[PDB]
Copies of this chain bind each other. A is one copy, B any other.
């Protein structure tokens, strides 16, 4: 081929969105270079085919035929298995390149204050939100709080970001580094004062990096063990966050000086923390064994030690001073047991104790045992801090605090942020697995069946045991495999250091018994320092009952003694939305938070909420700013935890500057809310929300639960069946086979509908609710409009729906139907699509927008440039599903299209992603590729 992809992108976007907008030129730059590398490696006919694919798909977005995708499907059908994998591979790489360009454009975009319109709506986009200094200034200047009050608030604030597995692709450090080199070359190529020779060489470097990324095929490395999954998960901490935290904390120092506070934020401030679910969450995942949990704790300790060893070595090089404390001098010469460099000999000792600490962990991991003594290593953060604080005090004593406030201060901030394990591990298990244990205990003792007892009979008995001083768990207790897994986990918790763990989380929590049950089990299995117990209220019924549950827990003397004035509660968004639709789930959650908070205030407990997957707070790219500000008043008060989904971890943390802005907005929003809460809801707002909720729930359950043919439609129109059967997703897709959607799990629910571009779980029920309110009273349309403009809760909830509609396409969802759904159920499909378009139309009306995402052109531009690649994979997926499912459906087989090489074990190559494949060679790898790429393009939805 000859011509560039520039033209087909221009016709997708209505112009430049800012006058430093070079995104389309970036996209064209990288993919034009990719296609040339593709042509030189595999021949012009292959490169021409891939580019034609892209053009058909880009043109469909320009105006949605559907006729053109079917003939695209016709050509992709009948490619040989090797050519299908190569095409799918190339389109995925192009999509990755587009995302890299977008990161570069966001990172170096010149701030433009003229875009701000004032008010809370500005905090929904990165282009208009307020940095840490602007929010500090607003607090002192508009809210009227003292700089001293702001300084004190920051000192008592902690934001805790919780990392979770990616649903389709791990990221190794190697590739993150290949990503950074592609980004760096693109930035440097666009410098103003560029020489021709530098440009020629930077061009050759860019082509080189793109080809290296294309010939590693990280795409086709077959899904890793849970330990590897955790190791690759830490890559972003290694590559951006580790150096990011000290950089941002230094900007906080800058900001408070700029409001009159002339001292730095003390280095012992846990302003930001990081936690992990990888190796800890075992809810419905038996691959996560007690040994896996021990393994990830030891791995974390190794990686920490390595990062510290290198920081300390760079620090030794810098601190060549000779003037020092008396106390530092006595210790320096003690360790001489070059001497004129006292900071160097202290830090060299720390480095060796760090090597011991890492080797000890490596041995415990390999052998279960290590003769390397705990004496020889660092066993506490206190023992690690002592030498570093000695050096800080010494350098200040001799008048060089300026030096100490360089990288030594950075290192101290890193120790108080990451500790010795980088992240703390959350443990999670479902409530009935605990009931199974206790029921085995009660019947073995002949006490009865805890399963059959009332909720209050349970409470009465468990409180009798907890107040009692006599053990309970028999050592000869007959255990099943599941019961042994729960007991074994607790034994692993007992054997490991307390600072390795965060909370123990109870999935499907319903009643105070679920919490007290694990308190008992923790003690009875020998956890001498118990973990805090955290309920996860998922269903609507449980959210309704949640404030009562926690009030009865707070009414118990024993429990108040144990929790010492602090309680954590986790709330689920996608969980609750799967129960009774999103809109009702959102409103029930707001109220549950509201009521839990005053229950908490009444008993004098500090309540912390942990926001699970699917939350508006989870949109870490920018909208999280407004989403946090929109939380009910007095719900945060300096302490909050948020799930960082894998599908957005690259967008938030892949790039140095974006990592900075992600950390910044979480800390700013959280700080401001505690001193500047949102408007309290009006009565007519509540009343309308209440009535809308019943209509939305009834509409959601009428289609999802009460319609017999729904499940059969679901497994035809989506790749849900193949997602499960294939080698992706790590987990069993549902709890028991064949109980409908009830036993299906949140991730497959959202994943399967997002792949088809339909997004049913996010919006269903909302159209009925809006229509019901408009029809009930003509004045209700104006009150919903006012709610969207005046009530942050209502704005962020529909802003999410708008974004997911921007990511949807009824034509493509209909193509899945046309190909894969039985004739008798196609009318049901088009009725769901009728609900889709009716919901979108009224959502736009209430927001006052003419077309989707009017008012966020930046987000609109970023999404639309992905669709050419996503749509290509959508057509590929649909036709691959029909041939997978229908054994003698074919069309014309085509002669091979790519060129290279008689070297290669061609058959073994079609099957990299799952060599034990039970599907015909090439189909499983082609379907996984479409799934990976569609997931990469869609990122966060519901």
Measured CB to CB, the residues of A under 8 A from B are 37, 40-41, 110, 133, 172-174, 177-178, 193, 197, 200-201, 205, 207-208, 211-212, 215-218, 250-251, 254-255, 257-258, 317-318, 320-323, 340, 398-400, 402-403, 405-406, 900-901, 903-904
Pick 25 A–B contacts, CB within 8 A, sort by A: A37-B402, A41-B399, A172-B320, A174-B318, A177-B317, A177-B318, A200-B254, A200-B257, A201-B250, A205-B406, A208-B402, A208-B405, A211-B400, A212-B318, A212-B321, A212-B406, A215-B323, A216-B321, A217-B322, A218-B322, A218-B340, A323-B903, A323-B904, A398-B903, A399-B900
B318 touches A211 (CB 8 A): no
Point out the residues of chain B lying under 8 angstroms from A251, CB to CB. 197, 201
Q: Which residues of B contact A254 (CB under 8 A)?
A: 197, 200-201
Check if A193 sits within 8 Å of B110, measured CB to CB.
Answer: yes
- Establish whether residues A402 and B173, one from each chain, have CB atoms under 8 Å apart when the complex forms: no
User: Is A317 in contact with B215, judged by CB distance below 8 angstroms?
Assistant: no
Whether the Cβ atoms of B133 and A320 lie closer than 8 Å is no
A234 to B651 alpha-carbon distance, docked (Å): 43
B212, A403: Cβ atoms closer than 8 Å: yes
Q: Which chain B residues border A406 with CB–CB below 8 Å?
A: 205, 208, 212
Residues of B close to A321: CB separation below 8 A: 212, 215-216
Closest-CB distance, A861 to chain B (whole angstroms): 23
Chain B's nearest CB lies how many Å from the CB of A219?
8
Pick the most buried of A110, A201, A250, A323: most chain B CB atoms within 10 A of its CB: A323
Whole-angstrom distance from the CB of A153 to the nearest CB of chain B? 21
Secondary structure type dominating chain A contacts:
helix
Known contacts A254-B201, A322-B217; decide if A208 and B133 are in contact (CB<8 Å): no
Among A41, A212, A340: residue with most chain B CB under 10 A: A212
Chain B residues lying within 8 Å of A340, measured Cβ to Cβ, are 218
Are B405's CB and A174's CB within 8 A?
A: no
Question: Please, which residues of chain B bring their CB within 8 A of the CB of A40?
Answer: 399
Specify which of B178, B211, B317 is in contact with A402 (CB 8 Å cutoff).
B211
Shortest A417–chain B CB gap in Å is 19
Contacts of A201 in B (CB 8 A): 250-251, 254
Quote the shortest CB–CB distance from A185 to chain B (angstroms).
12
Nearest 5 Cβ contacts at the A-B interface = A216-B320, A174-B320, A197-B254, A208-B406, A215-B321
**Shortest distance between the CB of A925 and any CB in chain B (Å):** 15
Q: A172 to chain B: which residues have CB within 8 Å?
A: 320
**How many Å lie between the Cα of A193 and that of B400 in the bound state?**
32
In the complex the two chains form, what is the Cα distance from A652 to B218 in whole Å? 44
Q: Contact: A174 with B317, CB < 8 Å?
A: yes
Contact of A403 among B173, B193, B200, B211 (CB under 8 A): B211
Q: Which residues of chain B come closer than 8 Å to A41, judged between CB atoms?
A: 399
Residue of B nearest to A215 (CB): B321
Q: Which residue of B lies closest to A173 (CB)?
A: B317
Question: Given A399-B41, A399-B900, are A133 and B197 also a contact pair (CB < 8 Å)?
Answer: yes
A205 to B410, CA, bound (A): 13
Q: Return chain B residues, CB-CB under 8 Å to A110.
A: 193
Chain B residues, CB < 8 A from A216 = 320-322
Within 8 Å CB of A205, what residues of B? 406
Query: Which residues of chain B are within 8 angstroms of A398 by Cβ–Cβ distance?
Result: 901, 903
A195, closest chain B residue (CB): B111
Give, as a whole number of angstroms, the nearest-CB distance from A208 to chain B: 5
Q: Report the Cα distance A218→B406, complex, angstroms.
A: 20
Given contacts A207-B402, A212-B318, A218-B322, 11 further A-B contacts (CB under 8 A): A172-B320, A174-B320, A197-B255, A201-B254, A208-B402, A211-B402, A212-B400, A212-B403, A216-B322, A398-B901, A399-B900
> What residues of B have a CB within 8 angstroms of the CB of A173 in the complex?
317
Contact assessment for A403 and B215 in the assembled complex, using a CB-CB cutoff below 8 Å: yes
Smallest beta-carbon distance A178→chain B, Å: 8
